[PDB]
Write a protein that binds this DNA or RNA. Structure first.
Ligand code: K
Ligand code: K
Ligand code: K
Ligand code: K
Ligand code: K
Ligand code: K
Ligand code: K
Ligand code: K
Ligand code: K
Ligand code: K
Ligand code: K
Ligand code: K
Ligand code: K
Ligand code: K
Ligand code: K
Ligand code: K
Ligand code: MG
Ligand code: MG
Ligand code: MG
Ligand code: MG
Ligand code: MG
Ligand code: MG
Ligand code: MG
Ligand code: MG
Ligand code: MG
Ligand code: MG
Ligand code: MG
Ligand code: MG
Ligand code: MG
Ligand code: MG
Lengths: 81, 134, 80, 87, 200
RNA sequence: GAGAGUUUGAUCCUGGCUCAGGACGAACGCUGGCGGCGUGCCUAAUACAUGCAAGUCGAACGCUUCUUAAGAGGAGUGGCGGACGGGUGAGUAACACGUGGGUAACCUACCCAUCAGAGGGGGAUAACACUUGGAAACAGGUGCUAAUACCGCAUAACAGUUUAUGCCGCAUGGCAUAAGAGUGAAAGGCGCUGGUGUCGCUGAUGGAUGGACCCGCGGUGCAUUAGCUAGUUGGUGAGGUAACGGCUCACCAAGGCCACGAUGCAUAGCCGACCUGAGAGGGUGAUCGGCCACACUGGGACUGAGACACGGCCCAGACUCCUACGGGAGGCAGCAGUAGGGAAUCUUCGGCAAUGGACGAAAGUCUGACCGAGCAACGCCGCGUGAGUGAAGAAGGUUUUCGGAUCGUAAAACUCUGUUGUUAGAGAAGAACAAGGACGUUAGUAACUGAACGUCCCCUGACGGUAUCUAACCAGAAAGCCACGGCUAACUACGUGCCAGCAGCCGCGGUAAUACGUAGGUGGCAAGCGUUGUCCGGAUUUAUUGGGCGUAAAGCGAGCGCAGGCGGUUUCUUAAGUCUGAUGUGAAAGCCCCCGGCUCAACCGGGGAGGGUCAUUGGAAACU
């Protein structure tokens, strides 16, 4: 980059991507754990359901996903439960 | 024709064509093709210089040059005025304009532009023939 | 409440389930000569239960895109 | 945000201005939402033509006059009307 | 550009006296040039129309471009005969107003006065000979200029003022009371031919 | 709503060709005084030296260098901006654009308004210090450090969702109320006096703004381009998106488009507008504005409210450049400028004073946007290059029928003017301001600073001593180009001899040329003139307005006929066409009409009108 602000944005955007990817993967793993528990017919399904909803809302916070996406996922998880 | 006939096949007009086609086409060296550019004049190099016989009604030795233009098209152009300094490999500028007498001359070599020297001793209509005011 | 465009037309294809093809059959003045020429626009309308058959006069109201080509919803079948 | 600002007009060395409501991102002489007045600085008492009611309505909607337009609206007394309307 | 060549030659080419004295025409009333004295063939209709157009524009000392634009304005006028309106505008031209008032003997002289700014309209300097003078506007000489022999001589010499002009000798101020009438204008000129000329 | 030349021995008709008009981002030839306003790579979306075109915030945070603890720096982190503004139009025949609708399938940082919250903790890491590698680009290691950086926990459901009611719509459904399950947030800075002002922070709603999607209709050529389509067409689910949707995927079907032109090929950014025309229309799509698309070529995503990002990142490729050969750096279609192409397009300039934009609480900093200035007669407009008197008419040129005619009142001479020019002087508006200094009124507080509003003082011009004004001097420095056989306004001499040459068409030139060259005159126009190029007109020469087909071009060799076009009389009805009213819209600028400002005009400003085979809605019923 030929501009100082451009270089600064390169660094900060890279860091933000690291953080965002980490947190989004965390949310996906929460959803994945709940879905697999539903498939397997486990006993902790309700605890995992609360965790999945909690993860999705916390992901909506921090702006990892849009609010509409968050509500769609909540509805999808609710249907699964 | 009936209105229904015209609706089914509308009127179509004749398409005109230029009297000076070589001026209408440019050339793109990279792509090695001809472009469609209307140019008032065009630069060319005299590939040949000489004189030609008019058509039957007239008799003279009309002075002409075979010129390859900057767009690689080769044409024949007339040399107006009395006496000239042109030779083959001389760089000239061409304008539109037919010569009734000559069979295949569609362009005129502008005098006073590039290697074409003005007409010696010209004193009336000096703009044409490209001579300075004495 | 704002209104969507509703058209009258004749069914010309019902070989697809949950859908019909309608034709509006308007006329337009030729720009140059002004004669009225027959002009056919056809729409793909979603049929709720494949009620309408071929060659039926029906009304269709514009809707949100229901498929790749669907943009209209059947309302009435006035002639069979 | 929405701006109330001067769109320049007239000729070289002889400026004129139209007080127009426009989005800040738009070009100065480019897209604008509406014209609400005019402003001719070349008059000894600078001449201002204003649609005071329209300007007040835009201010209520949340338009942000530029500095010069704010002075103009103050001189025309619109700003005091807007202040009282907020009350 | 402003024409400066001989005046008599132009007048006799047109076949009418531009100055109105007839002095140019009186002696040797031939078209200028060596072929003028000897008989010449009749002129075509285009030549006649061209001659009338030239008559007006040479009368008022205007160039073709300005003349053409003025004719178009006259056309825009809605009421009255088109050629008559065009001649009225030619009169309202500032140079002609000075000439009519008699502050200058000739239109060239009136034009030079306006160009050098010795004239003022409503007390304001105006250097534009082309300036359009409305009815009631007061054309006066600049105060500094009032004591110059040329304009004073012209005033005393000019004895006939058209009815539409009103002038005051001491103040040296004039104005058009009303638009000139057709007959008050030059009758020898036929405006219809000029109209058809520009119809082309 | 103008025509003219040309077929013949002559004529009428038909018919083509050519010319007289206007226009231009023009170029070229000759010539060239000034001013105002505008315009100036149309070609190579070709390659680019150099300089600049995106920074800002210390009142978010922790550091670090100096001035006698000051102010000024220096780099960090963090916030916002960088998605605007500027450039080009390559691609694109497409809901890209124009116009008119729809979204109950949508999103939206900054700006306003409402209602709530703003609690409690925690671990980091830059910077810094050393230190490894490297030629450089730059990467690492160790040990500290803060935040409005980051993460938890608490509380918030008004969000979303389900249910139950009530109301409503256009099918999916919408709105309001109630209940319910599960979960979700935050940050403090500056300043007055725990309270508090203000700027910030979080959640929800509404507004404005901006964006997104869908749809009717409109605008290129080629059929010597007729078949095209296989996620293609639809369905059922599932996933994905801000959102509907084959957007994607699995199954189920076999559908979808097309002579009302599919598909393919070629060309092209679209429009407001601009040129022409009597109009119908024809052409164009510069400058100005709107939309769209593109940023060395191709692909990709990241950050973000917003990009798949001109001056951001990753990869590939072509090219340029640096290497210590290990590896690196770059993208003017930003402003100037260079090279190249071309008939052909500008200064590597001044300023942020004005308008606008980013950041900031503000001063302020940044702004090649934008204001100006520079170059080009490139265009339009305006003014000159003097005015008055001045002879039966000077000299000289030209021409003579040798008398004389013409250049010509032209010159000379005399009398006047300074627009301009030269010289001196005097001299603007464009400036509103912000901040700051004073007060005063509102709302709020216990009170304050302070907020909003209000009134004074103070403060700033690149242009620039620029426009402009005044005064002195001088006709003195400032007119060319083309044309003169007819069309076409403009005529004679020589020289020339089918030569030299002219020419737009007819056609001129063979020894007496108004057609060639020169000369003298004359005509047109004028700081321009002419030539070429291209568009419209003339061209009724594609004829809807507005032509024809016996012999001039033109009736298929004839019939049978699908679709299509057209259709006898009449009652009733309908209202698609048709006519008419109202409403909404057809941006601004530009044409046109009124009215103003520049000494006039150009130009500028204000107010109108117009402009749709438009949408909604109300009427009429003759005709279709
Ligand atoms: K920064
Ligand atoms: K002939
Ligand atoms: K003819
Ligand atoms: K940003
Ligand atoms: K549309
Ligand atoms: K589906
Ligand atoms: K394009
Ligand atoms: K691309
Ligand atoms: K950028
Ligand atoms: K500024
Ligand atoms: K800078
Ligand atoms: K200011
Ligand atoms: K001729
Ligand atoms: K016809
Ligand atoms: K027959
Ligand atoms: K009807
Ligand atoms: Mg000639
Ligand atoms: Mg002022
Ligand atoms: Mg002029
Ligand atoms: Mg270009
Ligand atoms: Mg293109
Ligand atoms: Mg934070
Ligand atoms: Mg016509
Ligand atoms: Mg660049
Ligand atoms: Mg002067
Ligand atoms: Mg003639
Ligand atoms: Mg000759
Ligand atoms: Mg025609
Ligand atoms: Mg025959
Ligand atoms: Mg025949």
């Amino acid at each position: 980059p030929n501009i100082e602000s451009a270089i600064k944005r390169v660094r900060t955007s890279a860091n933000a991507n690291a953080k965002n990817s980490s947190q989004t993967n965390a949310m996906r793993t929460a959803i994945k754990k709940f879905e697999e528990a539903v498939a397997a017919g486990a006993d902790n399904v309700d605890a995992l359901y609360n965790e999945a909803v909690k993860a999705v809302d916390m992901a909506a916070t921090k702006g990892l996903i849009h609010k509409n996406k968050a509500n769609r996922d909540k509805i999808r998880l609710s249907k699964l439960a | 024709p009936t209105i229904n006939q015209l609706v089914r096949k509308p009127r179509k007009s004749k398409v005109e064509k230029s009297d000076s086609p070589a001026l209408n086409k440019g050339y793109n060296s990279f792509k090695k093709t001809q472009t469609n550019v209307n140019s008032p004049q065009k630069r060319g190099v005299c590939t040949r210089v000489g004189t030609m016989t008019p058509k039957k009604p007239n008799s003279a030795l009309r002075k002409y040059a075979r010129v390859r233009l900057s767009n690689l098209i080769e044409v024949t152009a007339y040399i107006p005025g009395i006496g000239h300094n042109l030779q083959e490999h001389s760089v000239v500028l061409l304008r539109g304009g037919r010569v009734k007498d000559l069979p295949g001359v569609r362009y005129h070599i502008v005098r006073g532009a590039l290697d074409t020297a003005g007409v010696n001793d010209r004193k009336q209509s000096r703009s044409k023939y490209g001579t300075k005011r004495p | 409440r704002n209104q969507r465009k509703v058209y009258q037309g004749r069914v010309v294809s019902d070989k697809m389930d949950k859908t019909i093809t309608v034709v509006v059959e308007t006329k337009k003045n030729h720009p140059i000569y002004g004669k009225r020429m027959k002009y056919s626009k056809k729409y793909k309308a979603h049929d709720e239960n494949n009620t309408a058959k071929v060659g039926d006069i029906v009304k269709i109201m514009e809707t949100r895109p229901l498929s790749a080509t669907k943009r209209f919803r059947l309302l009435e079948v006035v002639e069979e | 945000a929405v701006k109330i600002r001067l769109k320049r007009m007239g000729s070289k060395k002889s400026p004129f201005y139209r007080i127009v409501v426009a989005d800040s991102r738009s070009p100065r002489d480019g897209r604008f939402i509406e014209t609400v007045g005019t402003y001719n600085p070349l008059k000894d008492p600078a001449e201002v033509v204003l649609k005071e009611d329209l300007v007040l309505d835009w201010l209520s909607k949340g338009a942000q006059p530029s500095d010069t337009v704010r002075n103009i609206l103050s001189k025309e007394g619109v700003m005091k009307k807007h202040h009282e309307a907020k009350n | 550009s402003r024409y400066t060549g001989p005046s008599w030659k132009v007048s006799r080419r047109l076949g009418i006296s531009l100055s109105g004295t007839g002095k140019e025409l009186a002696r040797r009333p031939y078209k200028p040039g060596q072929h003028g004295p000897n008989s010449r063939g009749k002129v075509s209709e285009y030549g006649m129309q061209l001659t009338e157009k030239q008559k007006l524009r040479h009368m008022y000392g205007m160039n073709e471009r300005q003349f053409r634009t003025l004719f178009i304005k006259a056309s825009k006028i809605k009421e009255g005969k088109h050629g008559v309106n065009f001649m009225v505008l030619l009169e309202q031209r500032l140079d002609n107003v000075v000439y009519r008032l008699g502050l200058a003997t000739t239109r060239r002289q009136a034009r030079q006065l306006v160009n050098h700014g010795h004239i003022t309209v409503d007390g304001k300097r105006v250097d534009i000979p082309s300036y359009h003078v409305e009815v009631g506007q007061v054309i006066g000489v600049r105060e500094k200029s009032q004591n110059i022999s040329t304009i004073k001589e012209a005033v005393e010499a000019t004895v006939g003022r058209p009815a539409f002009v009103s002038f005051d000798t001491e103040k040296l101020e004039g104005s058009f009371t009303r638009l000139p009438e057709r007959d008050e204008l030059y009758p020898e000129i036929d405006e219809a031919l000029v109209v058809e000329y520009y119809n082309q």
